[model samples]
Target: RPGGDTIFGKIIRKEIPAKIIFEDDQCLAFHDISPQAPTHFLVIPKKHISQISAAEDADESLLGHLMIVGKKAAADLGLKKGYRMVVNEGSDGGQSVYHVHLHVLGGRQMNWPPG
Candidate 1:
């Protein structure tokens, strides 16, 4: 239940106002409205994917690229210790936005068994 046009689409098109952290041809990175960590931001595709679960074989490069950009952004943000990557897949996995987003959380001690 997560495909179709989305608010992230607006973000990608610059319709929604968000301070950009990183933006390449294929990716858009920004801070979350609701912060989950000291340094919490998101890396979303310029295109749309319902959720990480719905990502297709054609999305492999995009997925890998997201990780590369995520790490790049984290380093730019000065997360001297470490960072964590999260991808919420579906309703059961707490996927709030239909658009697939990779969450970058850092600047603190990230524990196991995330809630």
Candidate 2:
């Protein structure tokens, strides 16, 4: 299963160390070790879904909930001015990890048309 083998799955399983920011029955938000921005973090589903393209129709609520948690996480990280939520759908989308994850980035000015 995706959750059984993915790196994120290990984090959820507490098999690895992560600077957790928020967590609930369905999701987990944590700081990114290699931050791309001043306040970069990840919001992920407790259950693995691989990638956005691989998500099932039944995963709508879970996916939507991720957005909610991601937004709240950004605010909690003190992103009052603005923030960016990024979802890497596949290899071309820059998805290194197979599990579905949302990158919440802020605390600095973001440039348009991110490379």
Best by lDDT: 2
Task: Give lDDT per model, in order.
Answer: 0.88, 0.89
- Model 2 segments more than 4 A misplaced: none
Instruction: Please provide, for model 1 over 1-115, each residue's C-alpha lDDT reduced to its tens digit, 9 standing for 90 to 100.
Output: 1223787888887767887899988998999899989999999988778887788999999999999999999999998899999999777789888998999999999998887
Give the root-mean-square deviation of each candidate in angstroms: 2.6, 1.3
Q: How well does candidate 2 score on lDDT at residue 95?
A: 88
TM-score, model 2 to reference: 0.95
Candidate 2 lDDT over 1-115, as tens digits, reads 4355888999999989799999999999999999999999999998878789988889999999999999888877789999889998776798899888999899889998976
How much is the lDDT of residue 75 in candidate 2? 79
Q: Relative to the unseen true structure, what is the C-alpha lDDT of residue 74 in candidate 2, on a scale of 0 to 100? A: 84
Error of 2 at 11 (Å): 0.2
Candidate 1 residues lying further than 4 Å off, grouped into runs, are: 1-4
